[PDB]
Every structure is written in structure tokens, then in C-alpha cells.
Amino acid sequence: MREVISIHVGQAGVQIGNGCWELYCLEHGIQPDGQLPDAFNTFFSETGAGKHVPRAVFVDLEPTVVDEVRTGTYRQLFHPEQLISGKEDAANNYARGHYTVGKEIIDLTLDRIRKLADQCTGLQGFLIFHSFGGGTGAGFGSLLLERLSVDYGKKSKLEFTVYPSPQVSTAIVEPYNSILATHSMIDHSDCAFMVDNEALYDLCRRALDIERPTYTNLNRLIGQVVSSLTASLRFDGALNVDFTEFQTNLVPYARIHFPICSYAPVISAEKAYHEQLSVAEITNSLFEPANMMVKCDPRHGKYMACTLLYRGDVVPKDVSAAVATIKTKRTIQFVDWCPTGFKMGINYQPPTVVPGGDLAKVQRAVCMLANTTAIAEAWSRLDHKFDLMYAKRAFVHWYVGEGMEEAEFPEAREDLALLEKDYDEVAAES
Amino acid sequence: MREVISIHVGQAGVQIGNGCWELYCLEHGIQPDGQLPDAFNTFFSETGAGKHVPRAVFVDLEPTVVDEVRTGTYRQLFHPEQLISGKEDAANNYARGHYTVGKEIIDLTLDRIRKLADQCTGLQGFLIFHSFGGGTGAGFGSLLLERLSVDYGKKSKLEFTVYPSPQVSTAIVEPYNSILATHSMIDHSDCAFMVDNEALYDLCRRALDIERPTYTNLNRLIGQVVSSLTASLRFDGALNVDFTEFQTNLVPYARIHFPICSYAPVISAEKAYHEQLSVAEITNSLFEPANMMVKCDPRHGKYMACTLLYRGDVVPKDVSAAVATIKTKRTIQFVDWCPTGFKMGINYQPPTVVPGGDLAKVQRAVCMLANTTAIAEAWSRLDHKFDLMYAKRAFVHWYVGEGMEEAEFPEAREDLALLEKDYDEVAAES
Amino acid sequence: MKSPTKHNYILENWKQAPKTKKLHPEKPETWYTDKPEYGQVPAYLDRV
Amino acid sequence: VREIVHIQAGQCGNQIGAKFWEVISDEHGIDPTGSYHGDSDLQLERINVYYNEATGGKYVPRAILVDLEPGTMDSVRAGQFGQLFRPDNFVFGQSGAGNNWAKGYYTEGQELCESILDVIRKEAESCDCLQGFQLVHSLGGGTGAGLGTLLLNKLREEYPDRILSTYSIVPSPKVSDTVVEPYNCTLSVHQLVESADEVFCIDNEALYDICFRTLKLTTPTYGDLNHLVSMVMSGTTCALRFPGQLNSDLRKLAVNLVPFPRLHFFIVGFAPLTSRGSQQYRALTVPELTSQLFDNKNMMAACDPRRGVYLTASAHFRGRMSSKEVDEQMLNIQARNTSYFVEWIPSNVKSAICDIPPRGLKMAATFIGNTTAFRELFTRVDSQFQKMYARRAFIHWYVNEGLETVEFDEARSNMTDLIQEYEMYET
Amino acid sequence: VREIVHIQAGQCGNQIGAKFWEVISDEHGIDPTGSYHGDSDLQLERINVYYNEATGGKYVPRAILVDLEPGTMDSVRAGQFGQLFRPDNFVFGQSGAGNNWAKGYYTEGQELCESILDVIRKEAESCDCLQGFQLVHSLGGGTGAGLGTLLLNKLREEYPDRILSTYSIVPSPKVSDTVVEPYNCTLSVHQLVESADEVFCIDNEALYDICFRTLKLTTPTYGDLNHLVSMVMSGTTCALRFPGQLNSDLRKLAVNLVPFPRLHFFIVGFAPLTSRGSQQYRALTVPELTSQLFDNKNMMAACDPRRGVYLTASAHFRGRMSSKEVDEQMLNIQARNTSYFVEWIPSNVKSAICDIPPRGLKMAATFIGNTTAFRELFTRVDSQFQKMYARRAFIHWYVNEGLETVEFDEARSNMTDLIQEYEMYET
Amino acid sequence: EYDLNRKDYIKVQPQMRITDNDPWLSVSSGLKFDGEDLTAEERLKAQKEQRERWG
Numbered sequence A, B: 001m002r003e004v005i006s007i008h009v010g011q012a013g014v015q016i017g018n019g020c021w022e023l024y025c026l027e028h029g030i031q032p033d034g035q036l037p038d039a040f041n042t043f044f045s046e047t048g049a050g051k052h053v054p055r056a057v058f059v060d061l062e063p064t065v066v067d068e069v070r071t072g073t074y075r076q077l078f079h080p081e082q083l084i085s086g087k088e089d090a091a092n093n094y095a096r097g098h099y100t101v102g103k104e105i106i107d108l109t110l111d112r113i114r115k116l117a118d119q120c121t122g123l124q125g126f127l128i129f130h131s132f133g134g135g136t137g138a139g140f141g142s143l144l145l146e147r148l149s150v151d152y153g154k155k156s157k158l159e160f161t162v163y164p165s166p167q168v169s170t171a172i173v174e175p176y177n178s179i180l181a182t183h184s185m186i187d188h189s190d191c192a193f194m195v196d197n198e199a200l201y202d203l204c205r206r207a208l209d210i211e212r213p214t215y216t217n218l219n220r221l222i223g224q225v226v227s228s229l230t231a232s233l234r235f236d237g238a239l240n241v242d243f244t245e246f247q248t249n250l251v252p253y254a255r256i257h258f259p260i261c262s263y264a265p266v267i268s269a270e271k272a273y274h275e276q277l278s279v280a281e282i283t284n285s286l287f288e289p290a291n292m293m294v295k296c297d298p299r300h301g302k303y304m305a306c307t308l309l310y311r312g313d314v315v316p317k318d319v320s321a322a323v324a325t326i327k328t329k330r331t332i333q334f335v336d337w338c339p340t341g342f343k344m345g346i347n348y349q350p351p352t353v354v355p356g357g358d359l360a361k362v363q364r365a366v367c368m369l370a371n372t373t374a375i376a377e378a379w380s381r382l383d384h385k386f387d388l389m390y391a392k393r394a395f396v397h398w399y400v401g402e403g404m405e406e407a408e409f410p411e412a413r414e415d416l417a418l419l420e421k422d423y424d425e426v427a428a429e430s
Numbered sequence C: 001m002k003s004p005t006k007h008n009y010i011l012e013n014w015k016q017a018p019k020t021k022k023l024h025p026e027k028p029e030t031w032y033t034d035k036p037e038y039g040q041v042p043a044y045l046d047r048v
Numbered sequence D, E: 001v002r003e004i005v006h007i008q009a010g011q012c013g014n015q016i017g018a019k020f021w022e023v024i025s026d027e028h029g030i031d032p033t034g035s036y037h038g039d040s041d042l043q044l045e046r047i048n049v050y051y052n053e054a055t056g057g058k059y060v061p062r063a064i065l066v067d068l069e070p071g072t073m074d075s076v077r078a079g080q081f082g083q084l085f086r087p088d089n090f091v092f093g094q095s096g097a098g099n100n101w102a103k104g105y106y107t108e109g110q111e112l113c114e115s116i117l118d119v120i121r122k123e124a125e126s127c128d129c130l131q132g133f134q135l136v137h138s139l140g141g142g143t144g145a146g147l148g149t150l151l152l153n154k155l156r157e158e159y160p161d162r163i164l165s166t167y168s169i170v171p172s173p174k175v176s177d178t179v180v181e182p183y184n185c186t187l188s189v190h191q192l193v194e195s196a197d198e199v200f201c202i203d204n205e206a207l208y209d210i211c212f213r214t215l216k217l218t219t220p221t222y223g224d225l226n227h228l229v230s231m232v233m234s235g236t237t238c239a240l241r242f243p244g245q246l247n248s249d250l251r252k253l254a255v256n257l258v259p260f261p262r263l264h265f266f267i268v269g270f271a272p273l274t275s276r277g278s279q280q281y282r283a284l285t286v287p288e289l290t291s292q293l294f295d296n297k298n299m300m301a302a303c304d305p306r307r308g309v310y311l312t313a314s315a316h317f318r319g320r321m322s323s324k325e326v327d328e329q330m331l332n333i334q335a336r337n338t339s340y341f342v343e344w345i346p347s348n349v350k351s352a353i354c355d356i357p358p359r360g361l362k363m364a365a366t367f368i369g370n371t372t373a374f375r376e377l378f379t380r381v382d383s384q385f386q387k388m389y390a391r392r393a394f395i396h397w398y399v400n401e402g403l404e405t406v407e408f409d410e411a412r413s414n415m416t417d418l419i420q421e422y423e424m425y426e427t
Numbered sequence F: 001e002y003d004l005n006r007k008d009y010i011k012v013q014p015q016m017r018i019t020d021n022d023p024w025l026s027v028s029s030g031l032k033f034d035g036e037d038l039t040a041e042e043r044l045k046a047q048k049e050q051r052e053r054w055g
């Protein structure tokens, strides 16, 4: 029918994927084994009898995270070939995960993803997960996109990546790894979405009253966006949005593709008791800087085209009125070569409520994908961090030792400079 | 329908407010939990349940007063978002509540009031409460009005404040805060009402029969006046008065807005055994200086336009005879260029009594709002007290250290002097 | 012992109060879009 | 969430502070083992002001005890409520006190200063918020006066915004326990004037006078005298711990009572204090409290208010009571005795009401006032300091520690100017 | 499958390692007789890191034990866990130690080195994978200081890729137990700088100071000191053995912490430490763990971080905790103390979390840092080396073993160059 | 994940030490230490009575 392939790279990818496939199996009604006690085929293959197998490939250069699943409850769910593990991790070193370690396992990875695609008669895109600071997320992720571009060409390659936070940081060499990977992403990726832990932490504490979140809580929120993103191909509605529609509607140019995400409503059970949460309220909550999953103020820049997705008993009359209201906010700035400004989407399947969840049952929910020039702030933040280290050659010896050539460091600095120029040039006056 | 939003500032505003809302919920027939055992739309909103929610925001910079509501019986009625509490109070310092600590929470509150106005389809005005001597009441109230003026603009912002008493005082720095606040109040407020504690003590002991009152008894008397003011929008009547009518009829100029309050009959009801309390009786009781809620005798000054509000069994024939009689009284003056001088309204619903009550269940009552030049007496006292302290600069160092510049002290002192002659010129006739 | 010099402390207090130093300092923080090398090659690369 | 850090200095500080925690623990209902066995939910509302909890439901006060010799604390620890304190907050030296201000300031103070500050840093940065510190010490000694002032400067440098409230006991005029007191008190004032925000003056003779006049205690001990001091400390912070009709915390008090930065010394008094036989005659009314608080004999400082004039006054009331009755008394006492109030400040009496009274009482009140009568107390020790200094008296003991003779001249000049400052504003 | 080879050289290294295996065997549940009788399946997931299995369910550690005289070997043999070790892994000579660096490196070292390397080759080639080597030795002695560096060069020659992590003990600054330490340490530094990837320095004096200040230990024997060190060894490699939310192995630690090839000497620490009896008063949470970790007193090396500046720092967390809580604390400690961190490196604090804490504790943490304060320690040994060398003195005992005087000059020159390199990057 | 989030976390979670020496506090915990010789008094009395017999 219509299909999409999910690939998880590094700890931050596979750990999110564990929560995602929990939500998807529960939504469709498939037990963790893969049997039953529809849209199954867009995510799963039916091996026969009554068993289902997901379309996922788990990859990391160290076996600890994958062996958790292999020993976990879901071990029978997956194909053992899908679960791919290396021997020793990349040690947060881009050169180590791209030149030395990455190339030993890349061809094994490409066979299984290509073998998985043969069974997919009507495949229409890929979903790939990174963390920018990781060696495997960046070093191995770059090598994977480069090969898939020639392997599959004009197939939409969508990415869901964790953006390095402004102040929260767990890797010291983190700015070095992001810039080198950014060069490979910018040419090959069709569109790559941004989320960051720092904003999700604050959102998980304010809107949801979870004072002290873990990585587990944040993975469920990301799972709901992908569920809402892919729900148009699965369940019935009134305005269907395919993957290819995202590629044309969101990005005006080739190098300005990076969007940001938002979701509404996110509310605890004891707050939703007092709130109706109709169409007007959920539309307004999206555009507050508090709800953005990337910690950048939209008021710093301007907005180009946005895409909105609704899941619930939503009537088209209310959708047009809410966006009409959104255009009346003078605190929201749009660019005048984007007077259209919007694409809408409506679907009837409500959000899925995982048992023991942190989310209240809401009857309609809206997801927002928006592209803005506010993220030019974030690149200038990351660019400055790189300069201080490289002025004194702070960590070059580790990279050079693992096959990396030093000449790529200024070239990667050059490409980011052009990307920074492209934003102010786009955001410039008509 | 038509909506009014209530904002409460400081210890006075918050704990006056819960007195007001216990009145309204008992009046409409809503249990404290929001369930039931009409005009609900004017003050409440309905959710996806049989449950209601008030249109109110409670604001203070210290948690003790608000937390009493949070653990009280009424905790289930209010939305958890509506109750906003700071970390450390302003310590009766206007500068601390305006610049340093005020700006720490101003934008958090302004989102919540604006969000409530979205649910108010027919919003027509706001209600805001102050105590002038408090740092939060004057300092943060000024910052709230300045922002609210540009946010909404052409909407009627009505205020209900407690003027510092002529002799009773609880703060030594009290004159400083009132004059600085008076600057911000005068340009932005559409109309604000004066009452003072010293008169409310005297009335509650003389008219009502209580040897020893608390703030609880005074807070219930204030609620009755606001109840009578808002009864026109809620229940039926032969002569309705909207909020916008009060703005135009009462104030002759921009800077002379400040009216005073009165109410009749206020009686300990064993005394109500003896008398029938006709329309002429209650009309006469309004104009005695003993019944004024501000301890300034109108006989020192003159009357401009007055507004009369009748509730209950009053009939339009009897009103006309009563007001005609009060015009014949030669203890009451009116300025020459206001021959009309009156605005009358009649509503059918009599007042509502409360368990543990203080007042009677009388069948008819009258409320008054009058603008008089006798208020110029109060300004002279406050100005005189301010000059005594300021000549030797008795408390400036506290204000300047908390972000205040000294030049604001004389400039705020100049405008009150202009207001003092504003009242003297208007008091003249030609 | 040497007696203190007579000083009108009320006049000095009258003068000193406007000069009281503020407690909390302000912070207008530049945005990284304002960087002097925005969209252009940093100068330190040639030395590196 | 307005946490307060408690610091005790010297023999006077440790004995007063130890009795202070007996008062609060009973009020909140904390068993001496450190566990809650109380009787009201309101007690657990805002216990965070003074106590931290350890895993297992045990509450530990935010207390730091400081002395130069370990004799006093082992007496304190052996006391009934000794187990309550954290063992590692006990900071002591292995040297005698010496009864010397310079020795406390320079020789032994520097060694202990670094160790004490990190102990403060643990408790100061262990809470969600910090309003101010609280110091209890005497001025006539060498450890409380010497190391207390040195620690006072360091606290100001690190934490400028926070309120450094201190409670001091001033050496007595008639009979006093130390020969060299005028030296210690004169040097101590210079540090207190510029660094501390609020200072309360307690004199031991007034505490004795109150015990024999009012309470009729035939043989009062330091337990009786320290109990009276503990009530005032409990009263001032009671607005933080319990709800009330009109709140007034520490920062409100400093804003209202202090008109100028250098005039912040205060006198305190507590009502009702009742004799054993007068209880059957005394009908407890709000006016009854007003008579005691403004009565000169109830002053805990041996400086007579009638000899001076008031600048500001503040009263707290504890219990469920009428707001009209309290406000009327403030106006009545102000208008009746106008000869003792300054003209250029009207409404000199600040008022507040709190809901929950102290243990065993139905109504209680606390008074804090600021007046020019302090010129009596500073003139006294200045007169004694001058004669001991005109000829070089015991001074050689101070010079042999590192103190320069010019510091005495600076100490008197700064102190004498504060006397003149109150003289001028009386006009 | 990230096996690690362990080597014990000298008296100091051997006895620390003997205590070190007790800690691991308790944590995994392995009997002294090599039997498994544990309590959780998670212990058997990656036991392969440290142990080999003998057919019959008997587990044998990957340990190689080295000495020049069998005196310490027999002490380990009679120990409680003496039966655990592989009997053929005991390699020893038959000559006195001599306490001479030249004698250990040149005279007896060559004869023993050929046998030691092949015993290492037996274990290194026996496993499926090999990440790095683990050495425990002191720097002031004659066997460990000399033979340890000799083996370190050979291990570098044969296994260039693997991480050569070593743990060293530095001679004390005040009182030390050997006359000729400055010669031994200066000679050893030249080898350690160029050969070893990671070197951790621990001082005896800080270990005593930790025992009395925090642990209060009345009579701390060498068992308590060896206990403190082995915890840090267990903390570092725990990321290999057990799952967690964020894995961080040795090579991650090297890449993050080491900015330049020669600045790789580290200071270590551990938290929490039980003040016995006192910690009933202490509430253990994640912020409290951070307070001890970055407190200067808990560092195990007698170099004060405050007198220098930090370059990189890393902390591990063990147990179930909030991930946001850890990430916020690193931001908090880095922002509040900006003076101690370098500007040209943003986000100076690395973090890590692991799920399985040590038995009984809800949480525990380990701290590893790199700082310019190491210039204090190297100045100490250089100054002593200089005034001994001018008089010549004990060089008479090193010349008759075949060591040239130019080796002393080269050793000092390399050591001083290390000092200046730490000075320059402070700018 | 309620255990980490809840504010009664300090109340409910059992403390780290119980009376003498808890059976769940193993060697790896690093809280059982040997330097607190609580047998010092008995050893001291025995040693002098050993010296008394010698004298």
C-alpha cells in the first residue's frame, strides 16, 4: 500500500524507538509478541499465521543498548538481523565513527535496509534518528545518508534529530561533532526536524507537572509527534497530507530546510479537568514560545510556511477561524513573500493513551511543524562555541589520529558560514 | 454572552475576592466544588462536564494568602493556573514591587489574563482591586495597568481601591506609595472607586451591630456593592445599566474620575423589625455623611453627577418621587452645569444573604456611586503627610536602592498638585 | 583625646539618598546574530 | 520558602540559642529525637523556614554553633535537646577564649573563619531560597564580640542582599562580669554599624528587673532570663511560619522602622507577663496588652524611652482578634502621648496581626521600637572607655596581638558620631 | 565484551588490588572460592570484563601479580580472597627490592620482564576483545616506580591501540616514608608522560585527611585507605559492566577530558562518605552528591583546585535518578564559580549516569577532573630534586647500577617543561 | 516513574543505616569501614592486665 522505513542510530535514536514501537503496537492492537488477542501494513509485515514484524533497523556501534531489547520483552517482536550491534563505540569522536569504525559495519547495515525495502511495495520515505553530539549519531549517521542518496535517489529522506542544547551539555567535544555532521546533512537530507532536550525538560516540568523528568518521559512526547505525523497515511480523515507534501510546502529553498516542531495540548489529568481544550485554545497554545520544542524565541526572527495537523473531532469551520485568528496576532511575524503561509491537515483518530502515561485523555490534539529564521540564532550560538576551541586547537589530535584530515575543519566552518549567510539573506527585506 | 474579568492584587485584593466569589456562587446556586445540587456565563465558564469555573485571577508576591485558598474548601472551584503567587513580597516598597521584583512575574501573569479573555466572547470590561499602601497593591498594580492599557486599549477597565484612612494607618511609608501609584492610575484607568477602612469600621459598628469586627465583615460589605453593580448585566430589570454607561455618565473630565460609594439600608436586622424601609427611607439614608464609605463629608464640597442603583421591589413611580425630594433638600449641593445630575437603574432581584451573615434579608435596597469635590479633602491630607517626610528625605534610600530614580518623587508630587487645582477649578462656577 | 568635628549629618543624608547604589544590576544581552563575523570567514583561520 | 540560617556565637549565644530551639520545637511539635509527633496540620505548612529533613522523617534545624573553647558545647550537647543538631555543624577551637577582642579577631578568628564559612555555605545553599541570617551574641565578651564581627563582614561580602539580623546583649552599667568591657564594646560597634541591617539591644539588668517586678520570681536563673529573650525571637519570625490577617516579615520591618541607613538599633518588649497572683485579676483584653508593651518597665533594654523621643514603633499581635480594636489602640496611644513622638513623621506606629498564638497563651504581643534614648547607653560605655584610655590601662594585652593603637581612636570617633547623629534628628 | 587486563606491581599496588577484588566480588556476588551464588541476573551479563570462567562454574580474575621479592606475595596468598587468583599468574624474583629506581628498571627488571610479558600475553590473547590495560603502582618506591614504567613501555610497543590507564600514588608533601623519593619520581615522570593515556594521582596525606574530617575514623589502618581508592576504580569501569541511561567508557573519558597529548594527569574523588552516626541527619539527594563532589576537601590528591583553574571535569552517577536533575546541577556548579573554569572551553563539565548502584546505597557518584593545580605537586618534587642533586648525595647508589647523570638532567628538563605547559594554558 | 517525581520521596524511602550495622550495607557500599575500632576499650583493659601479670 504505502510504507515508511524507520532507522535508529546511536543510544538517543534506539531509546526513543523503544518508546515509539510501544505506542504503535498499542495503538493498532498488537501484543508485544506480535500477535493479536487495518493500517498494520504501513508499519508492519505479516509473516503469516497471526504474527507481525515491525519495519525497523536498530544500529549502534556498542552492544549495551541493543542487548537491552534482545533481553527485553520485545525480543520476539523484531527480526534478529534487524538488531545490529558493533563491538566498541565511537567514543564521541566523529572521525572514529566515520572512517575507522563506521566503515566496518556500513555494508552490513545497507544490505538489511535494502532487503527490508524489497518487501515494501509502495514505500514513500525514511525516518532516521540522530543525536548531534554523539560520535555514532554524527559520524555513522553522515556515512549512512551519503550511501542512501545514491542507493535510493529521489526518495524523501526525513530525519528526527536532537539539537544540541544552548546551555545543557553532556559532551565537551559536542560543538566539533555537530558542525562536521551538518555539512553532510545539508546536501543529502530532504528535511531534518529539530528538537532539543533543554526545551523538552522545561515543557515536561511546566505544562506537565513532572518536576524531575528522565529520558523515558521525553521519549513518549517525541513518539506522539511521529504518531501524529504518520497518522495521515494510516487512519481516515478529511485532509490527507502525504510525505511528499511536507517537502514542497515547508521549505522554500534547498538549504533552509530545517523546521521546528510543536504539539498541543500537553496537560496533566488534573489540569484538563478545568479546561475544555477546543479548537481555538489548542491553536493558540502552539504559537507561545513556551511550547516550542527547540529553545529559541520565534520573536527573534520571522515565520515562513507552517504545516498544521489535527487529530480528533475537529470541524473545518473552526480550523479556518483559528488560523484566521492566528493571522491577527501582531506578535507573530510572517514574511511577505509567503502570504499563503499555511497548509492544514485533519484526521479522525484521537491520541493514544499509554497505560501509566503522563498525559490526560484529550479529545482533539494538534501538531505543528513550522520553519522559521529564529534558528539562525542557534547556529550562531554553535558557531561561536566551535571558534573558541579551534582558535587554540583544543581537540584536533583526537580527530587527526583516527584518519581525519585537518583541512576539513575550516571547510566545515566555511559551509556553516554560507548557511548562516543564507538565513539573513532569506530573512532580509523583500 | 457578556463577560467581566476580575483581577485581584495583594492581601486585600485576594481575600476581598474570596468574599466576593462566595457571594456569587451562593447567589447563582453553584456548590463550592463547581457542581449544582442563567447568568452563569457572565462570571463563569462551562467545561466538558457539569462543572463551572470562575473568570478570576489571584495575584500576590507572597504565598501565604493564596495558599489559604489552595488548601481551603474552594480549592476545587478555581483553576490551578488562576492562583499566582510570588516568592518574596515587596515589603511595602513601591520600587521593589515595580522594577526589581515586579518584572520577575509580570509577563507570566499577562499570559494568563489574556488567555482567559479568549474564552470571553462578549468581554466588556475588567475589575481590578487594590490597597494603596501595599507594595504589591500599588507597585505591581501600576505595572499591570500600564501593560493592560496597550494590550486591550478601548475596553473599560474599572477599579475598586481602598484609600488610606485619614488617621488609621498600618504603614509608615504609606503616603509614599499612594502618590507614586496615583500617577500611573490617573492616565490609564477608565474609572476607579474609593472606599476606606476607617469609614467601614464606623459603619459596621453603628449601622450593623458588631462590637468587634474583622476584615471578614468589611470584605462582605464590599461584595454587596459589586453584586449590585453587576446585577444589571445578569438579572432582569426595568432600567439596565451597562459598564460603559458608568464610564460616560459619572466622570465629567478625564482626571476627575474618582467617585465615592454608598449603600442603604445597612441594618442589623433586629432593628429591621421596627421599620418597613420604603423607597423614600432608603433614598434619604444614602445622602447622610455617616453612610459614606469614604470618611469625607460632602458638605465641605459639591456634587457632580450621581448614579443610583435600586434592587428588589422598587417600582419606577416611587423612584421619581424620592429623587425629586432629595433635590429639594438644601443640605445637598450640585454644581450649576449639572442640572440633570442623576442616572437611575432598577433591578428586580433582591440581595442574597450568606450563612454566618451580618446583614438582613430585606426586600429592597439601593446602591449609590457619586462624584463629589469633597474628595479634594483626602488629597490634601495625603499630600501634606508626603511633604513632611520628603522634606528631610525620610525613606528615599530604600526606594532608590530598588531601581527607583529620585526624579520620579517630585514629578509624581507635581501631578497631584495639578490634580489638587484640577478639583479647585472644577469646583468653581460661572 | 581628639574630639570629633561637628558635621551636619542631615544635610549629608539629604544629599546621599539620591546617590544610593542600585542593588540588582541590569543585563541587556546581545544576540548571536549580532556577531561581528556573521556570514563571513573568521580571521583566525589563516593563522591556524 | 524563606529559609533562615541561625548562627550562635560564644557562651551567651550557645546558651540562648539552645533554649531558643526548645521553644520552637514545642511550638511546632517536634519530639527531641527529631521526629514529628504534633497535633495540627498548620505546623507542617512552613517548617521549611528553620528545618531540613533527613531521609527517614527526621528534621534537623539550620543551626551553626561557634565558640573558641569546647567547654560550652559539651554542656549544650548534654542538654535534653542536644541530639537535635547536626554533629558536623559544631565548630570549635582548641584554645582558651582569653576574653580578648583582638585575640578573637586576629589570632584565633582567622584560623576558624575559613572553616566556619564553608559550614555556613552548606546550609545557605541547601535551600530553595534564603531571606536572611540570624546572629545571637553578646558584646562584652571576647569570642562573641570578636569573631562575631569578623564573620559579620564575610557574610556581608558574599551575600549582600540578604538580611543580617543580629541580637546583641549590651554590657550592664552597675555590675558586670568583665573588667575590659569598654574596650570590647567600643571596637565591636564599628563593625555592627556598617555591616548589620538590624540590631536589637538587650541589657541583663532590665531582664532581672522584669523578673523581680512582674514575674515575682524569688530565685531567677539564666534559664528564666533567656526564656524571655526567646519569646521575642519567636515572635518576629511568626509571620513567616503561620498565616495571618496582615503579614509583616523581616524586610517589611526594616523598610518601615529604618529611616536612615545608620539608625537601625532597636529596643524590644513582650506582653503579657503576669505575676502568679495577678492572673486571677487580669482579664485578658486587647487594651491590656497595649498598656504593657508601651510601659517603660517592660522594656528589655535599660534605656528609658521617656528621656528620649520615638522615631518609629512597631507592634505584632498573635491570636484570633479584632482588626478594629488593634488599629484603634495604635491611634489612641499615639495621640495620648504626643510629647514623645517626632513631628516630621506621622503614623509612627506600625501594626500587624498573626493567627496562631504561642503555646499556653490565648493572646500575645511583641514590640519593637526605635528611639533616641540609645544615647544613654553609648554615653555610658564611652565615658568608661575614655578614662581607661586616657592613661594606658590593660591596653598592652591588645597591642601584643597585632592591634594598632589608632584602631581605638577610630573606634571612638565612629561611635561618638553615631551619638551625635541621634542628637541632631531629635530636633 | 570489553575485557580489561589488570596488573599489580610492588607492595603498594598489590595490597590495594587485593582489597580491590573484594569490592568487585561483593558487587557481582562471587565467592572467595570462585563460586557464583549471587542474587541478580544482571551480575552475569558482563562479568566477562574482569573474570575468566574455569570449567565447573569457577570464576578466575584477569590478574597479573608482580614483585621483586616474594614477601608481599605470601601475604596475599594467605588473604581471605587468596584462593581466587590463578597460581601461575604469580610472577616474582628472588632478590631484595633495593628501593632503587635504576636497580628495578635495569638490573632485575630485564630478567623478570620477559616472563611477565608472556604471562600478560596469555590473558590478553585469551579473550574475544581487549579495550585497555589496568596498572596499580606507586611512584616513590623502587619496584613499582621503575618496573611499572618498564612494563608500560613494552605494553605500548605491543598494543598501540589499547588504552593504558594507570593508577599512581604520589609521595606526601609533609611526611613521607622514603629517603630517596625525589630521584624516583622525577625519573618515572618521563616515561609516564609519553606512554600512558590516563594517569590518576592519589596522595596518602589526603586519604588520612578524608578519614578524619568526614569518616571520623579513630584508627584508620591501611585497609580503610585502600577501601577509598578501590571505590574509584570500581566507579570508572562500571559503565562497561552495567546498563544505564547514558554510557561513558574509558575512551569517551579520554576524548572529553584530554585537550592536548601531554595534559592528561587527573585528580579523583568519590561521594557520598558516611560520617558514621552523623549521616542519620543527612538527606542524600542528587544535589547533595554534587556538593561533596566539587567540595575541595573530598579530592584524594593534595593539590588545591582553587589555587588553579579547571580545564575539564567529569562526574558519574549510579542508581535511578532524574536525568534533568543531573544536567541542571552541572550547569549550576559551572555558572556559580566562573573564575575556576577557562573561557575558551565552553561546557567544562561532562556527566554520566548508570543504573545499578553499589549494594545498599540508593545512589553514589565518582568525580574525575583535570586542573592546572598539578603545578603545585610537580614544583614540590622538582625543588627537592634540585637541592639533593646539587650536593650529589645519594647519586652514588644509582651510578653503580648503570645510570648516567644525563638521565637526571633529561628527567628534570622534561618535568619542568610539563610545568610551563600548564602555566601557559592558564592564559 | 512516580518514585523519582514524588515530593514525599524523602519521607517514604528508608534511611541508609539501622542500629548496629545493616545487613544490606555490603562492602561495596563504602560505608562499612574498619577504622572505627569499637573494641578498643576491651583490648586496652586486656593488655594492661597482661602487663599486670608480667609485672
Ligand SMILES: Nc1nc2c(ncn2[C@@H]2O[C@H](COP(=O)(O)OP(=O)(O)OP(=O)(O)O)[C@@H](O)[C@H]2O)c(=O)[nH]1
Pocket: A009, A010, A011, A012, A015, A016, A060, A061, A089, A090, A091, A092, A093, A131, A132, A133, A134, A135, A136, A137, A138, A162, A170, A197, A215, A216, A218, A219, E245, E246
Ligand atoms: N531525548 C533523549 N536524548 C538522549 C537520550 N539518550 C541520549 N540522549 C542525547 O544524546 C546526546 C549524545 O549522543 P550519544 O548519547 O553519545 O549517542 P551516540 O551517537 O551513540 O554517541 P556514542 O555513544 O559516542 O556512540 C546527548 O546530548 C543526550 O542529550 C534519551 O534517552 N532521550
Ligand SMILES: Nc1nc2c(ncn2[C@@H]2O[C@H](COP(=O)(O)OP(=O)(O)OP(=O)(O)O)[C@@H](O)[C@H]2O)c(=O)[nH]1
Pocket: B009, B010, B011, B012, B015, B016, B060, B061, B089, B090, B091, B092, B093, B131, B132, B133, B134, B135, B136, B137, B138, B162, B164, B170, B197, B215, B216, B218, B219, D245, D246
Ligand atoms: N478592607 C480590607 N482591607 C484590607 C484587607 N487586608 C489588607 N487591607 C488593607 O491593605 C492595606 C495595605 O496593603 P497590603 O495589605 O500590605 O497589601 P499588599 O499590596 O499585598 O502589600 P505587600 O505585602 O507588600 O505585597 C492596609 O491599609 C489594610 O487596611 C482586607 O482583608 N479587607
Ligand SMILES: Nc1nc2c(ncn2[C@@H]2O[C@H](COP(=O)(O)OP(=O)(O)O)[C@@H](O)[C@H]2O)c(=O)[nH]1
Pocket: D009, D010, D011, D012, D015, D016, D097, D099, D138, D140, D141, D142, D143, D144, D145, D169, D176, D177, D178, D204, D222, D225, D226
Ligand atoms: N542573658 C544571658 N547572659 C549570659 C549568659 N551566659 C553569659 N552571659 C553574659 O555574657 C557576658 C559575656 O559572656 P562571655 O563569657 O564573655 O561569652 P564569650 O563571648 O564566649 O566570651 C557575661 O557578662 C555574662 O553575664 C546566659 O546564658 N544568658
Ligand SMILES: Nc1nc2c(ncn2[C@@H]2O[C@H](COP(=O)(O)OP(=O)(O)O)[C@@H](O)[C@H]2O)c(=O)[nH]1
Pocket: E009, E010, E011, E012, E015, E016, E097, E099, E138, E140, E141, E142, E143, E144, E145, E176, E177, E178, E222, E225, E226
Ligand atoms: N595506600 C597504601 N600505601 C602503602 C601501603 N604499603 C606501603 N605503602 C606506601 O608505598 C610507598 C612506597 O612503597 P614501596 O615499598 O617503596 O613500593 P616498591 O616500589 O614496590 O618498593 C611508601 O611510602 C608507603 O607509605 C599500603 O598497604 N597502602
Ligand SMILES: [Mg+2]
Pocket: A010, A011, A060, A061, A062, A089, A090, A134, A136
Ligand atoms: Mg553510542
Ligand SMILES: [Mg+2]
Pocket: B010, B011, B060, B061, B062, B089, B090, B134, B136, B137
Ligand atoms: Mg502582597
